[PDB]
Design an enzyme around this catalytic site. Structure first.
Site, PDB file in Angstrom:
ATOM      1  CB  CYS A  76      -0.985  -0.058   1.159  1.00  0.00           C
ATOM      2  SG  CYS A  76      -2.208   1.282   1.082  1.00  0.00           S
ATOM      3  CG  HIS A 163      -2.916  -4.324   3.641  1.00  0.00           C
ATOM      4  ND1 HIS A 163      -1.816  -3.802   4.300  1.00  0.00           N
ATOM      5  CD2 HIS A 163      -3.689  -3.272   3.274  1.00  0.00           C
ATOM      6  CE1 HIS A 163      -1.918  -2.487   4.325  1.00  0.00           C
ATOM      7  NE2 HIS A 163      -3.066  -2.135   3.694  1.00  0.00           N
ATOM      8  CD  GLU A 165      -0.039  -6.724   5.260  1.00  0.00           C
ATOM      9  OE1 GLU A 165      -0.101  -7.047   4.069  1.00  0.00           O
ATOM     10  OE2 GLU A 165      -0.013  -5.539   5.639  1.00  0.00           O
TER      11      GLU A 165
END
Length: 188
Positions: A76, A163, A165
């Protein structure tokens, strides 16, 4: 081991936890940690520039992106900072909101190996890469974002708008594993 520059975002610990889960060690360091200090430790195999609110207070990431001799994944904000560093453009796009976004993978690349050409990723589109840097290419897009992912064609540098993660990103760990592969990890 992977060094994570903390750009202030709230998913920074998720990056540590996701990497560890696939058996990769990582260390969270202030985003003002100098490049020379990160690269002084040969255990550091790659760098992740985390998400965060303010591109001005993540200026040091620009030096790291330009001058690091290690693989880089920008997430991002990190993705946007890489764009700036290499003379690309970034700006406000949609409105701040985390949404499941349908991401289309546009070409065969190391970052998306064993990831379907169509998958759902957890993303904000507050900002976006408006002009891709000279010498970079688009890896993936959505219906609202032309640059969901990019790589430097001749340097091991990667950006993702979303994202990987967070557990809500389909194959998000596979995407982290693929980066770690470029950093010399094997997952057999």
């Amino acid at each position: 081991m992977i060094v994570i520059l903390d750009n202030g975002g709230q998913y920074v610990h998720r990056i540590h936890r996701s990497l560890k889960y696939i058996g990769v060690s990582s260390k969270i360091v202030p985003n003002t940690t100098p490049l020379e200090e990160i690269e002084s430790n040969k255990e550091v195999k790659g760098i992740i520039l985390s998400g965060g609110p303010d591109i001005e207070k993540a200026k040091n990431c620009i030096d790291i992106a330009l001058n690091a001799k290690l693989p880089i994944l920008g997430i991002c904000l990190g993705h946007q900072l890489i764009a700036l560093a290499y003379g690309g453009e970034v700006g406000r796009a949609e409105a701040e909101e985390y949404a499941l976004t349908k991401v289309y993978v546009d070409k065969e690349n190391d970052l998306f190996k064993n990831v379907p050409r169509e998958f759902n990723a957890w993303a904000s589109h507050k900002d976006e890469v408006k002009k891709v840097p000279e010498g970079f290419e688009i890896l993936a897009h959505s219906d609202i974002c032309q640059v969901e992912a990019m790589l430097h064609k001749t340097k091991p540098i990667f950006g993702v708008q979303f994202h990987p993660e967070v557990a809500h990103t389909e194959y998000g760990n596979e995407i982290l594993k693929n980066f770690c592969k470029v950093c010399g990890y094997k997952f057999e």
